Write an enzyme that holds these catalytic residues in place. Structure first.
Site, PDB file in Angstrom:
ATOM      1  N   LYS A  38       1.682  -3.678   8.852  1.00  0.00           N
ATOM      2  CA  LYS A  38       3.015  -3.030   8.813  1.00  0.00           C
ATOM      3  C   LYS A  38       4.004  -4.080   9.316  1.00  0.00           C
ATOM      4  O   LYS A  38       3.784  -4.598  10.415  1.00  0.00           O
ATOM      5  CB  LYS A  38       3.018  -1.718   9.613  1.00  0.00           C
ATOM      6  N   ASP A  75       3.788  14.122  11.115  1.00  0.00           N
ATOM      7  CA  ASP A  75       3.971  13.862   9.654  1.00  0.00           C
ATOM      8  C   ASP A  75       2.616  13.876   8.957  1.00  0.00           C
ATOM      9  O   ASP A  75       2.321  12.971   8.158  1.00  0.00           O
ATOM     10  CB  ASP A  75       4.775  12.586   9.386  1.00  0.00           C
ATOM     11  N   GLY A  93       5.783   4.038   5.052  1.00  0.00           N
ATOM     12  CA  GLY A  93       5.522   5.056   6.093  1.00  0.00           C
ATOM     13  C   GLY A  93       6.774   5.865   6.385  1.00  0.00           C
ATOM     14  O   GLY A  93       7.738   5.793   5.574  1.00  0.00           O
ATOM     15  N   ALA A  94       6.806   6.595   7.503  1.00  0.00           N
ATOM     16  CA  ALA A  94       8.023   7.333   7.919  1.00  0.00           C
ATOM     17  C   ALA A  94       9.135   6.333   8.289  1.00  0.00           C
ATOM     18  O   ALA A  94      10.306   6.660   8.006  1.00  0.00           O
ATOM     19  CB  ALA A  94       7.736   8.304   9.034  1.00  0.00           C
ATOM     20  N   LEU A 111       0.868  -1.202   0.000  1.00  0.00           N
ATOM     21  CA  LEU A 111       0.000   0.000   0.000  1.00  0.00           C
ATOM     22  C   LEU A 111       0.903   1.250   0.000  1.00  0.00           C
ATOM     23  O   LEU A 111       0.509   2.258  -0.597  1.00  0.00           O
ATOM     24  CB  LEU A 111      -0.954  -0.118   1.190  1.00  0.00           C
TER      25      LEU A 111
HETATM   26  C1  LIG Z   1      -7.949  -0.487  -0.010  1.00  0.00           C
HETATM   27  C2  LIG Z   1      -6.783   0.390  -0.331  1.00  0.00           C
HETATM   28  N1  LIG Z   1      -6.427   0.561  -1.601  1.00  0.00           N
HETATM   29  N2  LIG Z   1      -5.329   1.369  -1.563  1.00  0.00           N
HETATM   30  C3  LIG Z   1      -4.671   1.752  -2.812  1.00  0.00           C
HETATM   31  C4  LIG Z   1      -5.021   1.715  -0.290  1.00  0.00           C
HETATM   32  C5  LIG Z   1      -5.931   1.099   0.531  1.00  0.00           C
HETATM   33  N3  LIG Z   1      -6.070   1.169   1.926  1.00  0.00           N
HETATM   34  C6  LIG Z   1      -5.126   1.468   2.878  1.00  0.00           C
HETATM   35  N4  LIG Z   1      -5.391   1.118   4.156  1.00  0.00           N
HETATM   36  C7  LIG Z   1      -4.481   1.337   5.124  1.00  0.00           C
HETATM   37  N5  LIG Z   1      -4.803   0.979   6.380  1.00  0.00           N
HETATM   38  C8  LIG Z   1      -3.263   1.974   4.764  1.00  0.00           C
HETATM   39  C9  LIG Z   1      -2.068   2.439   5.423  1.00  0.00           C
HETATM   40  C10 LIG Z   1      -1.808   2.338   6.822  1.00  0.00           C
HETATM   41  N6  LIG Z   1      -1.682   2.267   7.972  1.00  0.00           N
HETATM   42  C11 LIG Z   1      -1.252   3.014   4.426  1.00  0.00           C
HETATM   43  N7  LIG Z   1       0.024   3.621   4.479  1.00  0.00           N
HETATM   44  C12 LIG Z   1       1.027   3.499   3.416  1.00  0.00           C
HETATM   45  C13 LIG Z   1       2.295   3.903   4.109  1.00  0.00           C
HETATM   46  C14 LIG Z   1       1.807   4.970   5.075  1.00  0.00           C
HETATM   47  C15 LIG Z   1       0.489   4.411   5.627  1.00  0.00           C
HETATM   48  C16 LIG Z   1      -0.518   5.474   6.037  1.00  0.00           C
HETATM   49  N8  LIG Z   1      -1.901   2.933   3.211  1.00  0.00           N
HETATM   50  C17 LIG Z   1      -1.475   3.449   1.908  1.00  0.00           C
HETATM   51  C18 LIG Z   1      -3.118   2.311   3.394  1.00  0.00           C
HETATM   52  N9  LIG Z   1      -4.022   2.068   2.431  1.00  0.00           N
END
Ligand SMILES: Cc1nn(C)cc1Nc1nc(N)c2c(C#N)c(N3CCC[C@H]3C)n(C)c2n1
Ligand SMILES: [Cl-]
Ligand SMILES: [Cl-]
EC number: 2.7.11.1
Length: 257
Positions: free
Chosen positions: A31, A116, A11-12, A8
Protein backbone atom coordinates in the site's frame (compact mmCIF):
# COMPACT_ATOMS: atom_id res chain seq x y z
CA UNK A 1 13.93 -2.17 -4.16
CA UNK A 2 10.64 -3.54 -5.63
CA UNK A 3 8.87 -3.69 -9.03
CA UNK A 4 5.14 -2.64 -8.98
CA UNK A 5 3.65 -5.25 -11.44
CA UNK A 6 -0.09 -4.31 -11.10
CA UNK A 7 -2.85 -2.58 -9.04
CA UNK A 8 -4.80 -5.07 -6.87
CA UNK A 9 -7.37 -2.29 -6.09
CA UNK A 10 -8.20 0.86 -4.03
CA UNK A 11 -8.86 0.64 -0.24
CA UNK A 12 -10.97 3.06 1.88
CA UNK A 13 -7.97 5.55 1.94
CA UNK A 14 -5.41 4.52 -0.76
CA UNK A 15 -3.85 2.22 -3.44
CA UNK A 16 -2.61 -1.44 -3.23
CA UNK A 17 -0.15 -2.91 -5.80
CA UNK A 18 1.42 -6.32 -6.46
CA UNK A 19 5.16 -5.63 -5.78
CA UNK A 20 7.83 -8.19 -6.91
CA UNK A 21 11.22 -7.98 -5.08
CA UNK A 22 13.95 -7.05 -7.69
CA UNK A 23 16.57 -9.31 -5.91
CA UNK A 24 14.32 -12.14 -4.55
CA UNK A 25 11.17 -12.19 -6.82
CA UNK A 26 9.16 -12.53 -3.50
CA UNK A 27 5.66 -11.21 -4.47
CA UNK A 28 3.97 -8.99 -1.79
CA UNK A 29 1.03 -6.55 -1.62
CA UNK A 30 2.21 -2.97 -0.98
CA UNK A 31 0.00 0.00 0.00
CA UNK A 32 1.67 3.30 -1.14
CA UNK A 33 0.35 6.46 0.64
CA UNK A 34 1.09 10.24 0.00
CA UNK A 35 -1.32 11.40 7.81
CA UNK A 36 -2.65 11.22 11.38
CA UNK A 37 -4.64 8.51 9.47
CA UNK A 38 -1.67 6.32 8.32
CA UNK A 39 0.05 6.67 11.78
CA UNK A 40 -3.16 5.04 13.15
CA UNK A 41 -3.48 2.32 10.40
CA UNK A 42 0.20 1.16 10.95
CA UNK A 43 -0.29 1.04 14.75
CA UNK A 44 -3.48 -1.12 14.34
CA UNK A 45 -1.75 -3.36 11.75
CA UNK A 46 1.05 -3.92 14.36
CA UNK A 47 -1.53 -5.28 16.95
CA UNK A 48 -2.91 -7.94 14.55
CA UNK A 49 -2.08 -11.62 15.13
CA UNK A 50 -4.74 -14.03 13.82
CA UNK A 51 -5.13 -16.66 11.08
CA UNK A 52 -8.26 -14.80 9.76
CA UNK A 53 -6.56 -11.36 9.70
CA UNK A 54 -4.00 -10.33 6.97
CA UNK A 55 -0.24 -10.58 7.79
CA UNK A 56 1.46 -7.13 8.08
CA UNK A 57 5.23 -7.33 7.23
CA UNK A 58 6.16 -3.69 8.05
CA UNK A 59 6.50 -0.14 6.63
CA UNK A 60 9.01 2.31 5.00
CA UNK A 61 8.56 6.12 4.43
CA UNK A 62 10.37 8.35 1.84
CA UNK A 63 9.24 12.05 2.07
CA UNK A 64 5.97 12.57 0.06
CA UNK A 65 5.30 8.73 0.26
CA UNK A 66 4.87 5.80 2.75
CA UNK A 67 4.83 2.04 1.92
CA UNK A 68 2.84 -0.69 3.84
CA UNK A 69 3.95 -4.30 3.27
CA UNK A 70 1.41 -7.15 3.45
CA UNK A 71 1.15 -10.88 2.72
CA UNK A 72 -0.02 -11.26 -0.91
CA UNK A 73 -3.28 -13.32 -0.78
CA UNK A 74 -2.69 -15.94 -3.49
CA UNK A 75 -6.46 -16.68 -3.66
CA UNK A 76 -7.33 -12.99 -4.35
CA UNK A 77 -10.63 -11.65 -2.89
CA UNK A 78 -13.91 -13.21 -1.82
CA UNK A 79 -15.52 -10.70 -4.22
CA UNK A 80 -14.13 -12.77 -7.16
CA UNK A 81 -15.70 -16.04 -5.78
CA UNK A 82 -19.23 -14.53 -5.83
CA UNK A 83 -20.99 -15.39 -9.13
CA UNK A 84 -23.29 -12.43 -9.96
CA UNK A 85 -26.99 -13.29 -9.45
CA UNK A 86 -25.99 -16.84 -8.16
CA UNK A 87 -23.48 -16.49 -5.25
CA UNK A 88 -21.57 -19.65 -4.33
CA UNK A 89 -22.30 -23.15 -2.99
CA UNK A 90 -23.89 -22.89 0.48
CA UNK A 91 -21.13 -25.01 2.10
CA UNK A 92 -18.37 -22.65 0.79
CA UNK A 93 -20.47 -19.62 2.02
CA UNK A 94 -20.85 -21.22 5.54
CA UNK A 95 -17.11 -21.99 5.80
CA UNK A 96 -16.17 -18.39 4.76
CA UNK A 97 -18.80 -17.06 7.22
CA UNK A 98 -17.29 -19.27 10.04
CA UNK A 99 -13.85 -17.73 9.23
CA UNK A 100 -15.22 -14.15 8.95
CA UNK A 101 -16.80 -14.54 12.45
CA UNK A 102 -13.47 -15.94 13.82
CA UNK A 103 -11.68 -12.83 12.43
CA UNK A 104 -14.32 -10.35 13.68
CA UNK A 105 -14.39 -11.99 17.22
CA UNK A 106 -10.55 -11.65 17.28
CA UNK A 107 -10.73 -7.88 16.28
CA UNK A 108 -13.61 -7.08 18.70
CA UNK A 109 -11.76 -8.94 21.52
CA UNK A 110 -8.75 -6.56 21.08
CA UNK A 111 -11.14 -3.54 21.01
CA UNK A 112 -10.76 -2.90 17.24
CA UNK A 113 -13.70 -2.32 14.84
CA UNK A 114 -13.01 -2.75 11.10
CA UNK A 115 -15.93 -0.51 9.90
CA UNK A 116 -15.70 -1.56 6.17
CA UNK A 117 -16.39 -5.31 6.02
CA UNK A 118 -17.31 -6.30 2.46
CA UNK A 119 -16.09 -9.00 0.01
CA UNK A 120 -13.44 -6.64 -1.58
CA UNK A 121 -11.68 -6.52 1.89
CA UNK A 122 -11.85 -10.30 2.53
CA UNK A 123 -8.91 -12.16 0.91
CA UNK A 124 -8.16 -15.90 0.45
CA UNK A 125 -4.76 -17.64 0.96
CA UNK A 126 -3.64 -20.68 -1.20
CA UNK A 127 -5.82 -22.96 1.03
CA UNK A 128 -8.91 -20.60 0.63
CA UNK A 129 -8.66 -19.40 4.28
CA UNK A 130 -10.33 -15.98 4.62
CA UNK A 131 -8.30 -12.96 5.80
CA UNK A 132 -9.82 -9.62 6.88
CA UNK A 133 -7.75 -6.85 5.17
CA UNK A 134 -7.79 -3.01 4.73
CA UNK A 135 -7.47 -1.38 8.18
CA UNK A 136 -7.65 2.15 6.69
CA UNK A 137 -11.02 2.80 8.56
CA UNK A 138 -10.31 0.60 11.60
CA UNK A 139 -10.42 2.32 15.04
CA UNK A 140 -10.39 1.55 18.80
CA UNK A 141 -13.89 1.09 20.35
CA UNK A 142 -12.71 -0.37 23.68
CA UNK A 143 -9.67 0.65 25.78
CA UNK A 144 -8.92 -0.25 29.46
CA UNK A 145 -12.18 -2.29 29.39
CA UNK A 146 -14.18 0.93 28.60
CA UNK A 147 -16.38 1.13 25.47
CA UNK A 148 -16.42 4.34 23.39
CA UNK A 149 -19.33 5.00 20.98
CA UNK A 150 -18.48 5.86 17.35
CA UNK A 151 -19.73 9.21 16.03
CA UNK A 152 -18.25 9.21 12.44
CA UNK A 153 -20.05 7.95 9.29
CA UNK A 154 -17.81 5.73 7.12
CA UNK A 155 -17.75 2.42 5.23
CA UNK A 156 -19.73 1.47 2.14
CA UNK A 157 -23.41 2.38 1.77
CA UNK A 158 -24.87 -1.07 0.83
CA UNK A 159 -22.89 -2.66 3.77
CA UNK A 160 -23.54 0.06 6.46
CA UNK A 161 -25.95 -0.49 9.36
CA UNK A 162 -29.00 1.83 9.42
CA UNK A 163 -28.10 3.39 12.84
CA UNK A 164 -24.91 4.84 11.23
CA UNK A 165 -27.16 6.95 8.89
CA UNK A 166 -29.51 7.97 11.76
CA UNK A 167 -27.76 8.21 15.18
CA UNK A 168 -25.17 10.82 16.24
CA UNK A 169 -23.37 8.02 18.22
CA UNK A 170 -23.68 4.21 18.01
CA UNK A 171 -22.00 0.99 19.22
CA UNK A 172 -19.17 -0.36 16.94
CA UNK A 173 -19.87 -4.11 17.26
CA UNK A 174 -23.44 -4.26 15.86
CA UNK A 175 -22.28 -2.21 12.80
CA UNK A 176 -19.61 -4.88 11.95
CA UNK A 177 -22.22 -7.66 12.56
CA UNK A 178 -24.63 -5.94 10.08
CA UNK A 179 -21.93 -5.73 7.35
CA UNK A 180 -21.20 -9.48 7.93
CA UNK A 181 -24.94 -10.14 7.27
CA UNK A 182 -24.79 -8.24 3.97
CA UNK A 183 -21.62 -10.25 3.06
CA UNK A 184 -23.51 -13.52 3.84
CA UNK A 185 -26.41 -12.26 1.57
CA UNK A 186 -23.88 -11.55 -1.23
CA UNK A 187 -22.30 -15.06 -0.88
CA UNK A 188 -25.75 -16.82 -1.01
CA UNK A 189 -27.53 -14.67 -3.71
CA UNK A 190 -24.75 -12.96 -5.74
CA UNK A 191 -26.66 -9.68 -5.27
CA UNK A 192 -26.77 -6.86 -2.64
CA UNK A 193 -30.26 -6.35 -1.17
CA UNK A 194 -30.31 -2.49 -1.25
CA UNK A 195 -28.35 0.73 -2.09
CA UNK A 196 -28.55 1.78 1.56
CA UNK A 197 -30.66 0.83 4.59
CA UNK A 198 -32.86 3.98 4.60
CA UNK A 199 -36.73 4.25 4.49
CA UNK A 200 -36.18 6.26 1.23
CA UNK A 201 -34.92 2.85 -0.18
CA UNK A 202 -37.80 0.57 -1.34
CA UNK A 203 -35.79 -2.69 -1.23
CA UNK A 204 -35.01 -1.96 2.50
CA UNK A 205 -38.74 -1.14 3.21
CA UNK A 206 -39.73 -4.46 1.52
CA UNK A 207 -37.34 -6.31 3.90
CA UNK A 208 -38.70 -4.60 7.03
CA UNK A 209 -42.17 -5.64 5.68
CA UNK A 210 -40.75 -9.22 5.32
CA UNK A 211 -41.32 -9.64 1.54
CA UNK A 212 -38.82 -12.53 1.42
CA UNK A 213 -40.62 -13.93 -1.66
CA UNK A 214 -38.65 -11.12 -3.46
CA UNK A 215 -34.92 -11.27 -4.49
CA UNK A 216 -32.34 -11.65 -3.11
CA UNK A 217 -34.16 -13.44 -0.26
CA UNK A 218 -36.03 -16.00 -2.42
CA UNK A 219 -32.63 -17.36 -3.59
CA UNK A 220 -31.70 -18.07 0.05
CA UNK A 221 -32.55 -21.33 1.81
CA UNK A 222 -34.90 -20.89 4.82
CA UNK A 223 -32.14 -21.79 7.37
CA UNK A 224 -29.49 -19.14 6.40
CA UNK A 225 -32.42 -16.72 5.77
CA UNK A 226 -33.47 -17.23 9.43
CA UNK A 227 -29.92 -16.15 10.47
CA UNK A 228 -30.12 -13.12 8.15
CA UNK A 229 -33.50 -12.21 9.83
CA UNK A 230 -31.62 -11.91 13.20
CA UNK A 231 -28.52 -10.02 11.73
CA UNK A 232 -30.39 -7.48 9.58
CA UNK A 233 -32.51 -6.11 12.48
CA UNK A 234 -32.82 -2.26 12.20
CA UNK A 235 -32.59 -1.59 16.00
CA UNK A 236 -28.91 -2.31 16.92
CA UNK A 237 -29.87 -3.16 20.53
CA UNK A 238 -32.22 -5.98 19.28
CA UNK A 239 -29.70 -7.21 16.59
CA UNK A 240 -28.09 -10.64 17.24
CA UNK A 241 -24.56 -10.57 18.80
CA UNK A 242 -21.71 -12.85 17.64
CA UNK A 243 -22.10 -15.25 20.68
CA UNK A 244 -25.77 -15.89 19.59
CA UNK A 245 -24.73 -16.20 15.86
CA UNK A 246 -22.44 -19.05 17.09
CA UNK A 247 -25.69 -20.67 18.42
CA UNK A 248 -27.68 -20.27 15.18
CA UNK A 249 -29.12 -23.43 13.51
CA UNK A 250 -27.63 -22.77 10.02
CA UNK A 251 -24.30 -21.63 11.56
CA UNK A 252 -24.12 -25.11 13.24
CA UNK A 253 -25.52 -27.14 10.26
CA UNK A 254 -23.17 -29.85 8.83
CA UNK A 255 -22.79 -29.09 5.04
CA UNK A 256 -20.90 -31.11 2.32
CA UNK A 257 -17.70 -29.58 0.73
C1 LIG B 1 -2.69 -12.70 -6.00
C2 LIG B 1 -3.84 -11.77 -6.16
N1 LIG B 1 -4.45 -11.69 -7.34
N2 LIG B 1 -5.42 -10.75 -7.19
C3 LIG B 1 -6.29 -10.41 -8.32
C4 LIG B 1 -5.43 -10.26 -5.92
C5 LIG B 1 -4.43 -10.89 -5.24
N3 LIG B 1 -4.05 -10.77 -3.89
C6 LIG B 1 -4.25 -9.72 -3.02
N4 LIG B 1 -3.49 -9.68 -1.91
C7 LIG B 1 -3.60 -8.65 -1.05
N5 LIG B 1 -2.82 -8.67 0.05
C8 LIG B 1 -4.55 -7.64 -1.34
C9 LIG B 1 -5.04 -6.43 -0.73
C10 LIG B 1 -4.59 -5.89 0.52
N6 LIG B 1 -4.21 -5.54 1.55
C11 LIG B 1 -6.04 -5.92 -1.58
N7 LIG B 1 -6.86 -4.77 -1.50
C12 LIG B 1 -7.27 -3.98 -2.67
C13 LIG B 1 -7.70 -2.68 -2.05
C14 LIG B 1 -8.31 -3.14 -0.74
C15 LIG B 1 -7.35 -4.22 -0.23
C16 LIG B 1 -8.01 -5.28 0.63
N8 LIG B 1 -6.19 -6.76 -2.66
C17 LIG B 1 -7.14 -6.68 -3.77
C18 LIG B 1 -5.30 -7.81 -2.53
N9 LIG B 1 -5.17 -8.83 -3.39
CL1 LIG C 1 -21.06 -9.06 -4.50
CL1 LIG D 1 -23.97 -20.61 26.74
Amino acid sequence: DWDLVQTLGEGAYGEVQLAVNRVTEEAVAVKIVDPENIKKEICILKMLNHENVIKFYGHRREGNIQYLFMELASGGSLFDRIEPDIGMPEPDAQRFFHQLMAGVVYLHGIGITHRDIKPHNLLLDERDNLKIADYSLATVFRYNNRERLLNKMCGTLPYVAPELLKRREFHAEPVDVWSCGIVLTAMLAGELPWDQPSDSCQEYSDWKEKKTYLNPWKKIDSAPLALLHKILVENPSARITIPDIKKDRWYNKPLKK
